[PDB]
């Protein structure tokens with residue numbers, strides 16, 4: 001079916017639950033043996049969220065190559081994304097080591113450092129120009145250059161220095177700051193606007209490494225981000241835009257990382273955003 005009237009009519013019969021469950025029932029299952037080694041326990045935020053062996057990002061080091069991060073590779077759409085958990089205090093250095101090695105241009109953050117009174121991820125970037133951060137274990141330096149604070153998101157300009165070779169690179173930090181503590185946004189407007197600002201920077205482009213995206217666990221809000229972009233990019237690519245099947249796209253993406261889209265509310269928002277962005281950017 002066209003994705004607009006599946007929506008009008010899921011709300012109507014209201015089977016959002018039902019639909020979301022079939023997706024869970026049909027999603028891929030692949031091994032995660034590396035994530036589950038004892039030696040990595042402390043490297044995972046959540047015990048039920050792990051990267052598949054086949055698609056995990058490997059750090060370049062003899063030590064331990066492990067990070068909770070997955071490469072999502074969309075073939076027809078010609079877009080790749082790295083989805084990862086928000087970093088822990090002990091893993092911050094691994095995170096930036098990963099950004100350096102994969103040659104990413106942008107980092108996209110869909111959550112606040114603190115939500116609902118608990119820590120959602122480490123404060124992993126510097127907040128004042130004159131106070132730079134240094135990751136000792138991976139031998140990197142990170143400096144804040146500038147920042148643009150707008151009402152629904154912020155953009156930061158950062159400098160990452162490989163202290164071993166003295167090479168420097170410019171990283172963009174795209175920080176969506178207003179997703180609610182509970183539930184999903186009510187309108188997708190601002191989310192839509194954020195998404196187009198990321199495209200505009202060149203961060204999602206092939207002339208760079210994959211974009212790094214994350215929230216808490218790296219599956220819920222992060223999955224909405226990548227599903228939406230890919231669905232909107234496919235729409236413009238096909239002779240008939242209406243042929244795009246979002247459930248099909250989501251199940252493809254779940255071949256590369258478990259659990260993408262965590263609630264039916266999030267599934268709904270995804271359709272809603274795609275339906276709306278279709279008719280605008282068109």
Ligand SMILES: O=C(O)CSc1ccc(Cl)cc1
Pocket residue numbers: 042043088089090
């Ligand atoms: O949770 C943190 O603070 C970082 S993860 C971690 C968990 C357990 C141990 Cl023993 C060390 C780090």
